[PDB]
Amino acid sequence: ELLEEEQQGPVTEQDIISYVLYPKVYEQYIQTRNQYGNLSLLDTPTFFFGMRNGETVEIEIDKGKRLIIKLETISEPDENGNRTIYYAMNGQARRI
Amino acid sequence: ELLEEEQQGPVTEQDIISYVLYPKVYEQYIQTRNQYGNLSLLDTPTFFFGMRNGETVEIEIDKGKRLIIKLETISEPDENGNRTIYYAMNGQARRIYIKDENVHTNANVKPKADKSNPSHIGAQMPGSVTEVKVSVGETVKANQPLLITEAMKMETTIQAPFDGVIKQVTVNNGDTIATGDLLIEIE
């Protein structure tokens, strides 16, 4: 009842026991999952370091379907410390 | 006659005496008009200083027609000293390439070598290029010196793996390199 209230809805038996064993850590894992998704699919170098300019990274999402990400550039920080990253996802231009 | 032939073929009276009066300068104006268009339309600050990151410039062309230019960002120079500018011009993503005129000499970013490609030779260690010994289009034998580098006061000479042809040389004398940068491509 606590986890179902917190997350969107349906929780598994594996969630229940993970929370019990590690309340804080599990709660933190959900928040990161909500923000970033399934990080475990990144290759380790990308997981630890991100990407360099001109680099292209493939993320294996599933058998025969992959996420193709190219980092083109990172801009200067604006007046609010916000840098613009110019990406190329699956053939489409993309800014963050 | 001469001015009609050089250009497309309009030429006015104002063009004719202008040439007669200043032959060297008029031709050099024509070249510039052909390269950059009517620069007089620019506002002075932009004419003298270009554009800041994030700035929006409005260029009044004519009654009710204007270029709305925003400079978003300028990349690092690629291996050739070519920087990429990211503009937006009347609601349209835009990319332009400008050679940087030796204001860094070596801060060119080298593309990284595809390690699963035999034609790609990459840098084994960080260091400096001491001497480029071959250029693009040249035929080389196997074991031929192509390049000398200096890592930590120590000189290694980079050699051709197989008999073939140089298709791109990525560096110049004095450029610094990091582990994994492409230096030469040969077939």
JSON list of N, CA and C in Angstrom, two decimals, chain A residues 13-90:
[
{"chain": "A", "resi": 13, "resn": "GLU", "atom": "N", "xyz": [6.15, -8.36, -6.15]},
{"chain": "A", "resi": 13, "resn": "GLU", "atom": "CA", "xyz": [6.65, -8.99, -4.93]},
{"chain": "A", "resi": 13, "resn": "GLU", "atom": "C", "xyz": [8.12, -8.67, -4.71]},
{"chain": "A", "resi": 14, "resn": "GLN", "atom": "N", "xyz": [8.88, -8.56, -5.80]},
{"chain": "A", "resi": 14, "resn": "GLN", "atom": "CA", "xyz": [10.31, -8.23, -5.72]},
{"chain": "A", "resi": 14, "resn": "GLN", "atom": "C", "xyz": [10.56, -6.81, -5.22]},
{"chain": "A", "resi": 15, "resn": "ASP", "atom": "N", "xyz": [9.60, -5.92, -5.46]},
{"chain": "A", "resi": 15, "resn": "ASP", "atom": "CA", "xyz": [9.70, -4.55, -4.98]},
{"chain": "A", "resi": 15, "resn": "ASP", "atom": "C", "xyz": [9.48, -4.51, -3.48]},
{"chain": "A", "resi": 16, "resn": "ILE", "atom": "N", "xyz": [8.45, -5.22, -3.03]},
{"chain": "A", "resi": 16, "resn": "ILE", "atom": "CA", "xyz": [8.09, -5.28, -1.62]},
{"chain": "A", "resi": 16, "resn": "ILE", "atom": "C", "xyz": [9.30, -5.70, -0.76]},
{"chain": "A", "resi": 17, "resn": "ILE", "atom": "N", "xyz": [9.98, -6.78, -1.14]},
{"chain": "A", "resi": 17, "resn": "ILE", "atom": "CA", "xyz": [11.08, -7.27, -0.34]},
{"chain": "A", "resi": 17, "resn": "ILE", "atom": "C", "xyz": [12.34, -6.39, -0.44]},
{"chain": "A", "resi": 18, "resn": "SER", "atom": "N", "xyz": [12.56, -5.79, -1.61]},
{"chain": "A", "resi": 18, "resn": "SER", "atom": "CA", "xyz": [13.65, -4.84, -1.81]},
{"chain": "A", "resi": 18, "resn": "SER", "atom": "C", "xyz": [13.50, -3.59, -0.96]},
{"chain": "A", "resi": 19, "resn": "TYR", "atom": "N", "xyz": [12.30, -3.06, -0.90]},
{"chain": "A", "resi": 19, "resn": "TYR", "atom": "CA", "xyz": [12.02, -1.92, -0.04]},
{"chain": "A", "resi": 19, "resn": "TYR", "atom": "C", "xyz": [12.28, -2.25, 1.42]},
{"chain": "A", "resi": 20, "resn": "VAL", "atom": "N", "xyz": [11.75, -3.39, 1.87]},
{"chain": "A", "resi": 20, "resn": "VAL", "atom": "CA", "xyz": [11.93, -3.83, 3.26]},
{"chain": "A", "resi": 20, "resn": "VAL", "atom": "C", "xyz": [13.41, -3.95, 3.61]},
{"chain": "A", "resi": 21, "resn": "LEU", "atom": "N", "xyz": [14.20, -4.51, 2.71]},
{"chain": "A", "resi": 21, "resn": "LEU", "atom": "CA", "xyz": [15.60, -4.74, 2.97]},
{"chain": "A", "resi": 21, "resn": "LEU", "atom": "C", "xyz": [16.38, -3.46, 2.89]},
{"chain": "A", "resi": 22, "resn": "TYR", "atom": "N", "xyz": [15.97, -2.58, 1.98]},
{"chain": "A", "resi": 22, "resn": "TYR", "atom": "CA", "xyz": [16.70, -1.33, 1.74]},
{"chain": "A", "resi": 22, "resn": "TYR", "atom": "C", "xyz": [15.77, -0.14, 1.48]},
{"chain": "A", "resi": 23, "resn": "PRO", "atom": "N", "xyz": [15.04, 0.33, 2.52]},
{"chain": "A", "resi": 23, "resn": "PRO", "atom": "CA", "xyz": [14.05, 1.40, 2.33]},
{"chain": "A", "resi": 23, "resn": "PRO", "atom": "C", "xyz": [14.59, 2.61, 1.54]},
{"chain": "A", "resi": 24, "resn": "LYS", "atom": "N", "xyz": [15.53, 3.36, 2.11]},
{"chain": "A", "resi": 24, "resn": "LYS", "atom": "CA", "xyz": [16.09, 4.56, 1.46]},
{"chain": "A", "resi": 24, "resn": "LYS", "atom": "C", "xyz": [16.60, 4.29, 0.04]},
{"chain": "A", "resi": 25, "resn": "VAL", "atom": "N", "xyz": [17.51, 3.33, -0.08]},
{"chain": "A", "resi": 25, "resn": "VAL", "atom": "CA", "xyz": [18.16, 3.00, -1.34]},
{"chain": "A", "resi": 25, "resn": "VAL", "atom": "C", "xyz": [17.14, 2.66, -2.43]},
{"chain": "A", "resi": 26, "resn": "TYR", "atom": "N", "xyz": [16.16, 1.84, -2.07]},
{"chain": "A", "resi": 26, "resn": "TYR", "atom": "CA", "xyz": [15.12, 1.49, -3.02]},
{"chain": "A", "resi": 26, "resn": "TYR", "atom": "C", "xyz": [14.36, 2.76, -3.43]},
{"chain": "A", "resi": 27, "resn": "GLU", "atom": "N", "xyz": [13.96, 3.58, -2.47]},
{"chain": "A", "resi": 27, "resn": "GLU", "atom": "CA", "xyz": [13.27, 4.83, -2.79]},
{"chain": "A", "resi": 27, "resn": "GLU", "atom": "C", "xyz": [14.09, 5.71, -3.74]},
{"chain": "A", "resi": 28, "resn": "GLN", "atom": "N", "xyz": [15.40, 5.74, -3.54]},
{"chain": "A", "resi": 28, "resn": "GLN", "atom": "CA", "xyz": [16.30, 6.51, -4.40]},
{"chain": "A", "resi": 28, "resn": "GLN", "atom": "C", "xyz": [16.41, 5.92, -5.81]},
{"chain": "A", "resi": 29, "resn": "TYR", "atom": "N", "xyz": [16.39, 4.58, -5.89]},
{"chain": "A", "resi": 29, "resn": "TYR", "atom": "CA", "xyz": [16.39, 3.88, -7.17]},
{"chain": "A", "resi": 29, "resn": "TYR", "atom": "C", "xyz": [15.15, 4.19, -8.02]},
{"chain": "A", "resi": 30, "resn": "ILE", "atom": "N", "xyz": [13.98, 4.29, -7.39]},
{"chain": "A", "resi": 30, "resn": "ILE", "atom": "CA", "xyz": [12.76, 4.68, -8.09]},
{"chain": "A", "resi": 30, "resn": "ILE", "atom": "C", "xyz": [12.88, 6.09, -8.67]},
{"chain": "A", "resi": 31, "resn": "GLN", "atom": "N", "xyz": [13.34, 7.03, -7.85]},
{"chain": "A", "resi": 31, "resn": "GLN", "atom": "CA", "xyz": [13.49, 8.43, -8.29]},
{"chain": "A", "resi": 31, "resn": "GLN", "atom": "C", "xyz": [14.40, 8.56, -9.50]},
{"chain": "A", "resi": 32, "resn": "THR", "atom": "N", "xyz": [15.52, 7.81, -9.50]},
{"chain": "A", "resi": 32, "resn": "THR", "atom": "CA", "xyz": [16.46, 7.79, -10.64]},
{"chain": "A", "resi": 32, "resn": "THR", "atom": "C", "xyz": [15.85, 7.12, -11.86]},
{"chain": "A", "resi": 33, "resn": "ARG", "atom": "N", "xyz": [15.09, 6.05, -11.63]},
{"chain": "A", "resi": 33, "resn": "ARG", "atom": "CA", "xyz": [14.37, 5.37, -12.70]},
{"chain": "A", "resi": 33, "resn": "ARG", "atom": "C", "xyz": [13.32, 6.30, -13.32]},
{"chain": "A", "resi": 34, "resn": "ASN", "atom": "N", "xyz": [12.64, 7.08, -12.48]},
{"chain": "A", "resi": 34, "resn": "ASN", "atom": "CA", "xyz": [11.66, 8.06, -12.96]},
{"chain": "A", "resi": 34, "resn": "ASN", "atom": "C", "xyz": [12.29, 9.16, -13.81]},
{"chain": "A", "resi": 35, "resn": "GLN", "atom": "N", "xyz": [13.54, 9.48, -13.51]},
{"chain": "A", "resi": 35, "resn": "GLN", "atom": "CA", "xyz": [14.23, 10.58, -14.17]},
{"chain": "A", "resi": 35, "resn": "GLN", "atom": "C", "xyz": [14.94, 10.10, -15.43]},
{"chain": "A", "resi": 36, "resn": "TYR", "atom": "N", "xyz": [15.59, 8.94, -15.35]},
{"chain": "A", "resi": 36, "resn": "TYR", "atom": "CA", "xyz": [16.55, 8.53, -16.36]},
{"chain": "A", "resi": 36, "resn": "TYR", "atom": "C", "xyz": [16.22, 7.23, -17.09]},
{"chain": "A", "resi": 37, "resn": "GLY", "atom": "N", "xyz": [15.32, 6.43, -16.53]},
{"chain": "A", "resi": 37, "resn": "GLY", "atom": "CA", "xyz": [14.95, 5.15, -17.13]},
{"chain": "A", "resi": 37, "resn": "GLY", "atom": "C", "xyz": [15.91, 4.02, -16.81]},
{"chain": "A", "resi": 38, "resn": "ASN", "atom": "N", "xyz": [16.03, 3.08, -17.73]},
{"chain": "A", "resi": 38, "resn": "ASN", "atom": "CA", "xyz": [16.83, 1.88, -17.51]},
{"chain": "A", "resi": 38, "resn": "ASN", "atom": "C", "xyz": [18.28, 2.11, -17.87]},
{"chain": "A", "resi": 39, "resn": "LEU", "atom": "N", "xyz": [19.05, 2.59, -16.90]},
{"chain": "A", "resi": 39, "resn": "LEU", "atom": "CA", "xyz": [20.45, 2.91, -17.09]},
{"chain": "A", "resi": 39, "resn": "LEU", "atom": "C", "xyz": [21.28, 1.68, -17.40]},
{"chain": "A", "resi": 40, "resn": "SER", "atom": "N", "xyz": [20.83, 0.53, -16.92]},
{"chain": "A", "resi": 40, "resn": "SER", "atom": "CA", "xyz": [21.59, -0.71, -17.08]},
{"chain": "A", "resi": 40, "resn": "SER", "atom": "C", "xyz": [21.88, -1.10, -18.54]},
{"chain": "A", "resi": 41, "resn": "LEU", "atom": "N", "xyz": [21.17, -0.49, -19.49]},
{"chain": "A", "resi": 41, "resn": "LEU", "atom": "CA", "xyz": [21.37, -0.81, -20.92]},
{"chain": "A", "resi": 41, "resn": "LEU", "atom": "C", "xyz": [22.53, -0.04, -21.56]},
{"chain": "A", "resi": 42, "resn": "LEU", "atom": "N", "xyz": [23.00, 1.01, -20.89]},
{"chain": "A", "resi": 42, "resn": "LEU", "atom": "CA", "xyz": [24.17, 1.75, -21.37]},
{"chain": "A", "resi": 42, "resn": "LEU", "atom": "C", "xyz": [25.39, 0.87, -21.24]},
{"chain": "A", "resi": 43, "resn": "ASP", "atom": "N", "xyz": [26.32, 1.02, -22.17]},
{"chain": "A", "resi": 43, "resn": "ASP", "atom": "CA", "xyz": [27.63, 0.44, -21.99]},
{"chain": "A", "resi": 43, "resn": "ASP", "atom": "C", "xyz": [28.30, 1.19, -20.82]},
{"chain": "A", "resi": 44, "resn": "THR", "atom": "N", "xyz": [29.19, 0.50, -20.12]},
{"chain": "A", "resi": 44, "resn": "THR", "atom": "CA", "xyz": [29.82, 1.04, -18.91]},
{"chain": "A", "resi": 44, "resn": "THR", "atom": "C", "xyz": [30.58, 2.38, -19.10]},
{"chain": "A", "resi": 45, "resn": "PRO", "atom": "N", "xyz": [31.38, 2.50, -20.19]},
{"chain": "A", "resi": 45, "resn": "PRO", "atom": "CA", "xyz": [32.04, 3.78, -20.44]},
{"chain": "A", "resi": 45, "resn": "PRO", "atom": "C", "xyz": [31.07, 4.96, -20.55]},
{"chain": "A", "resi": 46, "resn": "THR", "atom": "N", "xyz": [29.93, 4.76, -21.20]},
{"chain": "A", "resi": 46, "resn": "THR", "atom": "CA", "xyz": [28.94, 5.82, -21.36]},
{"chain": "A", "resi": 46, "resn": "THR", "atom": "C", "xyz": [28.24, 6.08, -20.03]},
{"chain": "A", "resi": 47, "resn": "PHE", "atom": "N", "xyz": [28.01, 5.01, -19.28]},
{"chain": "A", "resi": 47, "resn": "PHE", "atom": "CA", "xyz": [27.39, 5.11, -17.97]},
{"chain": "A", "resi": 47, "resn": "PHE", "atom": "C", "xyz": [28.24, 5.97, -17.03]},
{"chain": "A", "resi": 48, "resn": "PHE", "atom": "N", "xyz": [29.57, 5.82, -17.12]},
{"chain": "A", "resi": 48, "resn": "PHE", "atom": "CA", "xyz": [30.49, 6.51, -16.21]},
{"chain": "A", "resi": 48, "resn": "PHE", "atom": "C", "xyz": [30.96, 7.89, -16.67]},
{"chain": "A", "resi": 49, "resn": "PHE", "atom": "N", "xyz": [31.04, 8.09, -17.99]},
{"chain": "A", "resi": 49, "resn": "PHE", "atom": "CA", "xyz": [31.67, 9.28, -18.56]},
{"chain": "A", "resi": 49, "resn": "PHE", "atom": "C", "xyz": [30.81, 10.13, -19.49]},
{"chain": "A", "resi": 50, "resn": "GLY", "atom": "N", "xyz": [29.68, 9.59, -19.94]},
{"chain": "A", "resi": 50, "resn": "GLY", "atom": "CA", "xyz": [28.84, 10.29, -20.91]},
{"chain": "A", "resi": 50, "resn": "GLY", "atom": "C", "xyz": [29.42, 10.12, -22.30]},
{"chain": "A", "resi": 51, "resn": "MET", "atom": "N", "xyz": [29.45, 11.20, -23.08]},
{"chain": "A", "resi": 51, "resn": "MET", "atom": "CA", "xyz": [29.95, 11.12, -24.45]},
{"chain": "A", "resi": 51, "resn": "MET", "atom": "C", "xyz": [30.89, 12.26, -24.78]},
{"chain": "A", "resi": 52, "resn": "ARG", "atom": "N", "xyz": [31.84, 12.00, -25.69]},
{"chain": "A", "resi": 52, "resn": "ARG", "atom": "CA", "xyz": [32.70, 13.06, -26.23]},
{"chain": "A", "resi": 52, "resn": "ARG", "atom": "C", "xyz": [32.12, 13.63, -27.54]},
{"chain": "A", "resi": 53, "resn": "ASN", "atom": "N", "xyz": [32.53, 14.83, -27.91]},
{"chain": "A", "resi": 53, "resn": "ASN", "atom": "CA", "xyz": [32.05, 15.46, -29.14]},
{"chain": "A", "resi": 53, "resn": "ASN", "atom": "C", "xyz": [32.41, 14.65, -30.39]},
{"chain": "A", "resi": 54, "resn": "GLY", "atom": "N", "xyz": [31.42, 14.44, -31.25]},
{"chain": "A", "resi": 54, "resn": "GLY", "atom": "CA", "xyz": [31.62, 13.70, -32.49]},
{"chain": "A", "resi": 54, "resn": "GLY", "atom": "C", "xyz": [31.46, 12.21, -32.30]},
{"chain": "A", "resi": 55, "resn": "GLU", "atom": "N", "xyz": [31.22, 11.80, -31.06]},
{"chain": "A", "resi": 55, "resn": "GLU", "atom": "CA", "xyz": [31.07, 10.39, -30.75]},
{"chain": "A", "resi": 55, "resn": "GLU", "atom": "C", "xyz": [29.66, 9.92, -31.03]},
{"chain": "A", "resi": 56, "resn": "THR", "atom": "N", "xyz": [29.55, 8.64, -31.37]},
{"chain": "A", "resi": 56, "resn": "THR", "atom": "CA", "xyz": [28.29, 8.00, -31.66]},
{"chain": "A", "resi": 56, "resn": "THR", "atom": "C", "xyz": [28.21, 6.77, -30.78]},
{"chain": "A", "resi": 57, "resn": "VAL", "atom": "N", "xyz": [27.08, 6.63, -30.09]},
{"chain": "A", "resi": 57, "resn": "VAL", "atom": "CA", "xyz": [26.86, 5.51, -29.20]},
{"chain": "A", "resi": 57, "resn": "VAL", "atom": "C", "xyz": [25.56, 4.80, -29.57]},
{"chain": "A", "resi": 58, "resn": "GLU", "atom": "N", "xyz": [25.63, 3.47, -29.63]},
{"chain": "A", "resi": 58, "resn": "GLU", "atom": "CA", "xyz": [24.45, 2.65, -29.83]},
{"chain": "A", "resi": 58, "resn": "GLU", "atom": "C", "xyz": [24.03, 2.06, -28.50]},
{"chain": "A", "resi": 59, "resn": "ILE", "atom": "N", "xyz": [22.75, 2.16, -28.18]},
{"chain": "A", "resi": 59, "resn": "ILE", "atom": "CA", "xyz": [22.21, 1.54, -26.99]},
{"chain": "A", "resi": 59, "resn": "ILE", "atom": "C", "xyz": [21.29, 0.40, -27.42]},
{"chain": "A", "resi": 60, "resn": "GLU", "atom": "N", "xyz": [21.65, -0.83, -27.08]},
{"chain": "A", "resi": 60, "resn": "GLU", "atom": "CA", "xyz": [20.80, -1.99, -27.38]},
{"chain": "A", "resi": 60, "resn": "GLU", "atom": "C", "xyz": [19.56, -2.01, -26.49]},
{"chain": "A", "resi": 61, "resn": "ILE", "atom": "N", "xyz": [18.43, -1.60, -27.07]},
{"chain": "A", "resi": 61, "resn": "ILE", "atom": "CA", "xyz": [17.14, -1.55, -26.38]},
{"chain": "A", "resi": 61, "resn": "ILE", "atom": "C", "xyz": [16.48, -2.93, -26.31]},
{"chain": "A", "resi": 62, "resn": "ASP", "atom": "N", "xyz": [16.71, -3.72, -27.36]},
{"chain": "A", "resi": 62, "resn": "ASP", "atom": "CA", "xyz": [16.06, -5.01, -27.55]},
{"chain": "A", "resi": 62, "resn": "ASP", "atom": "C", "xyz": [16.67, -5.63, -28.80]},
{"chain": "A", "resi": 63, "resn": "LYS", "atom": "N", "xyz": [16.43, -6.93, -29.01]},
{"chain": "A", "resi": 63, "resn": "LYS", "atom": "CA", "xyz": [16.93, -7.65, -30.18]},
{"chain": "A", "resi": 63, "resn": "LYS", "atom": "C", "xyz": [16.55, -6.89, -31.46]},
{"chain": "A", "resi": 64, "resn": "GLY", "atom": "N", "xyz": [17.57, -6.42, -32.18]},
{"chain": "A", "resi": 64, "resn": "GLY", "atom": "CA", "xyz": [17.36, -5.74, -33.46]},
{"chain": "A", "resi": 64, "resn": "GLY", "atom": "C", "xyz": [16.85, -4.31, -33.44]},
{"chain": "A", "resi": 65, "resn": "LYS", "atom": "N", "xyz": [16.47, -3.81, -32.26]},
{"chain": "A", "resi": 65, "resn": "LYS", "atom": "CA", "xyz": [16.15, -2.38, -32.11]},
{"chain": "A", "resi": 65, "resn": "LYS", "atom": "C", "xyz": [17.11, -1.69, -31.14]},
{"chain": "A", "resi": 66, "resn": "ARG", "atom": "N", "xyz": [17.79, -0.67, -31.65]},
{"chain": "A", "resi": 66, "resn": "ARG", "atom": "CA", "xyz": [18.80, 0.05, -30.89]},
{"chain": "A", "resi": 66, "resn": "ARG", "atom": "C", "xyz": [18.64, 1.57, -30.97]},
{"chain": "A", "resi": 67, "resn": "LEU", "atom": "N", "xyz": [19.07, 2.26, -29.92]},
{"chain": "A", "resi": 67, "resn": "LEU", "atom": "CA", "xyz": [19.05, 3.73, -29.88]},
{"chain": "A", "resi": 67, "resn": "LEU", "atom": "C", "xyz": [20.39, 4.27, -30.35]},
{"chain": "A", "resi": 68, "resn": "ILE", "atom": "N", "xyz": [20.37, 5.01, -31.45]},
{"chain": "A", "resi": 68, "resn": "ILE", "atom": "CA", "xyz": [21.58, 5.61, -32.00]},
{"chain": "A", "resi": 68, "resn": "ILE", "atom": "C", "xyz": [21.66, 7.10, -31.63]},
{"chain": "A", "resi": 69, "resn": "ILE", "atom": "N", "xyz": [22.65, 7.43, -30.80]},
{"chain": "A", "resi": 69, "resn": "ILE", "atom": "CA", "xyz": [22.84, 8.78, -30.28]},
{"chain": "A", "resi": 69, "resn": "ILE", "atom": "C", "xyz": [24.21, 9.31, -30.67]},
{"chain": "A", "resi": 70, "resn": "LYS", "atom": "N", "xyz": [24.21, 10.48, -31.29]},
{"chain": "A", "resi": 70, "resn": "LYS", "atom": "CA", "xyz": [25.43, 11.20, -31.62]},
{"chain": "A", "resi": 70, "resn": "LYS", "atom": "C", "xyz": [25.45, 12.52, -30.85]},
{"chain": "A", "resi": 71, "resn": "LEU", "atom": "N", "xyz": [26.56, 12.80, -30.18]},
{"chain": "A", "resi": 71, "resn": "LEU", "atom": "CA", "xyz": [26.78, 14.10, -29.56]},
{"chain": "A", "resi": 71, "resn": "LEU", "atom": "C", "xyz": [27.54, 14.98, -30.53]},
{"chain": "A", "resi": 72, "resn": "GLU", "atom": "N", "xyz": [26.91, 16.07, -30.97]},
{"chain": "A", "resi": 72, "resn": "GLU", "atom": "CA", "xyz": [27.55, 17.01, -31.89]},
{"chain": "A", "resi": 72, "resn": "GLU", "atom": "C", "xyz": [28.38, 18.04, -31.16]},
{"chain": "A", "resi": 73, "resn": "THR", "atom": "N", "xyz": [27.74, 18.84, -30.30]},
{"chain": "A", "resi": 73, "resn": "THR", "atom": "CA", "xyz": [28.45, 19.85, -29.50]},
{"chain": "A", "resi": 73, "resn": "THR", "atom": "C", "xyz": [27.71, 20.15, -28.21]},
{"chain": "A", "resi": 74, "resn": "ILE", "atom": "N", "xyz": [28.43, 20.80, -27.30]},
{"chain": "A", "resi": 74, "resn": "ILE", "atom": "CA", "xyz": [27.86, 21.40, -26.10]},
{"chain": "A", "resi": 74, "resn": "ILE", "atom": "C", "xyz": [28.17, 22.89, -26.16]},
{"chain": "A", "resi": 75, "resn": "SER", "atom": "N", "xyz": [27.17, 23.71, -25.90]},
{"chain": "A", "resi": 75, "resn": "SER", "atom": "CA", "xyz": [27.34, 25.15, -25.97]},
{"chain": "A", "resi": 75, "resn": "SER", "atom": "C", "xyz": [27.98, 25.71, -24.71]},
{"chain": "A", "resi": 76, "resn": "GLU", "atom": "N", "xyz": [28.19, 27.02, -24.74]},
{"chain": "A", "resi": 76, "resn": "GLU", "atom": "CA", "xyz": [28.58, 27.79, -23.56]},
{"chain": "A", "resi": 76, "resn": "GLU", "atom": "C", "xyz": [27.41, 27.85, -22.59]},
{"chain": "A", "resi": 77, "resn": "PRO", "atom": "N", "xyz": [27.70, 28.00, -21.28]},
{"chain": "A", "resi": 77, "resn": "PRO", "atom": "CA", "xyz": [26.61, 28.14, -20.32]},
{"chain": "A", "resi": 77, "resn": "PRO", "atom": "C", "xyz": [25.92, 29.48, -20.50]},
{"chain": "A", "resi": 78, "resn": "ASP", "atom": "N", "xyz": [24.59, 29.47, -20.56]},
{"chain": "A", "resi": 78, "resn": "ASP", "atom": "CA", "xyz": [23.84, 30.72, -20.65]},
{"chain": "A", "resi": 78, "resn": "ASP", "atom": "C", "xyz": [23.86, 31.45, -19.31]},
{"chain": "A", "resi": 79, "resn": "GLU", "atom": "N", "xyz": [23.03, 32.48, -19.20]},
{"chain": "A", "resi": 79, "resn": "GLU", "atom": "CA", "xyz": [22.97, 33.32, -18.00]},
{"chain": "A", "resi": 79, "resn": "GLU", "atom": "C", "xyz": [22.41, 32.60, -16.77]},
{"chain": "A", "resi": 80, "resn": "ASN", "atom": "N", "xyz": [21.92, 31.37, -16.98]},
{"chain": "A", "resi": 80, "resn": "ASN", "atom": "CA", "xyz": [21.38, 30.56, -15.89]},
{"chain": "A", "resi": 80, "resn": "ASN", "atom": "C", "xyz": [22.15, 29.25, -15.72]},
{"chain": "A", "resi": 81, "resn": "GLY", "atom": "N", "xyz": [23.39, 29.23, -16.21]},
{"chain": "A", "resi": 81, "resn": "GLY", "atom": "CA", "xyz": [24.26, 28.05, -16.15]},
{"chain": "A", "resi": 81, "resn": "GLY", "atom": "C", "xyz": [23.76, 26.86, -16.96]},
{"chain": "A", "resi": 82, "resn": "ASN", "atom": "N", "xyz": [22.94, 27.15, -17.97]},
{"chain": "A", "resi": 82, "resn": "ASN", "atom": "CA", "xyz": [22.34, 26.10, -18.80]},
{"chain": "A", "resi": 82, "resn": "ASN", "atom": "C", "xyz": [23.04, 25.94, -20.15]},
{"chain": "A", "resi": 83, "resn": "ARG", "atom": "N", "xyz": [23.73, 24.82, -20.31]},
{"chain": "A", "resi": 83, "resn": "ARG", "atom": "CA", "xyz": [24.41, 24.51, -21.57]},
{"chain": "A", "resi": 83, "resn": "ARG", "atom": "C", "xyz": [23.45, 23.77, -22.50]},
{"chain": "A", "resi": 84, "resn": "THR", "atom": "N", "xyz": [23.51, 24.09, -23.79]},
{"chain": "A", "resi": 84, "resn": "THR", "atom": "CA", "xyz": [22.71, 23.40, -24.78]},
{"chain": "A", "resi": 84, "resn": "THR", "atom": "C", "xyz": [23.54, 22.29, -25.43]},
{"chain": "A", "resi": 85, "resn": "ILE", "atom": "N", "xyz": [23.01, 21.07, -25.39]},
{"chain": "A", "resi": 85, "resn": "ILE", "atom": "CA", "xyz": [23.65, 19.93, -26.07]},
{"chain": "A", "resi": 85, "resn": "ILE", "atom": "C", "xyz": [22.93, 19.62, -27.37]},
{"chain": "A", "resi": 86, "resn": "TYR", "atom": "N", "xyz": [23.70, 19.58, -28.46]},
{"chain": "A", "resi": 86, "resn": "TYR", "atom": "CA", "xyz": [23.14, 19.29, -29.77]},
{"chain": "A", "resi": 86, "resn": "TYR", "atom": "C", "xyz": [23.39, 17.83, -30.11]},
{"chain": "A", "resi": 87, "resn": "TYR", "atom": "N", "xyz": [22.30, 17.07, -30.17]},
{"chain": "A", "resi": 87, "resn": "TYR", "atom": "CA", "xyz": [22.33, 15.62, -30.32]},
{"chain": "A", "resi": 87, "resn": "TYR", "atom": "C", "xyz": [21.77, 15.16, -31.67]},
{"chain": "A", "resi": 88, "resn": "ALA", "atom": "N", "xyz": [22.09, 13.92, -32.05]},
{"chain": "A", "resi": 88, "resn": "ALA", "atom": "CA", "xyz": [21.44, 13.28, -33.18]},
{"chain": "A", "resi": 88, "resn": "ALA", "atom": "C", "xyz": [20.92, 11.91, -32.77]},
{"chain": "A", "resi": 89, "resn": "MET", "atom": "N", "xyz": [19.62, 11.84, -32.49]},
{"chain": "A", "resi": 89, "resn": "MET", "atom": "CA", "xyz": [18.97, 10.59, -32.14]},
{"chain": "A", "resi": 89, "resn": "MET", "atom": "C", "xyz": [18.24, 10.00, -33.33]},
{"chain": "A", "resi": 90, "resn": "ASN", "atom": "N", "xyz": [18.58, 8.75, -33.65]},
{"chain": "A", "resi": 90, "resn": "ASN", "atom": "CA", "xyz": [17.91, 8.00, -34.70]},
{"chain": "A", "resi": 90, "resn": "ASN", "atom": "C", "xyz": [17.58, 8.87, -35.91]}
]
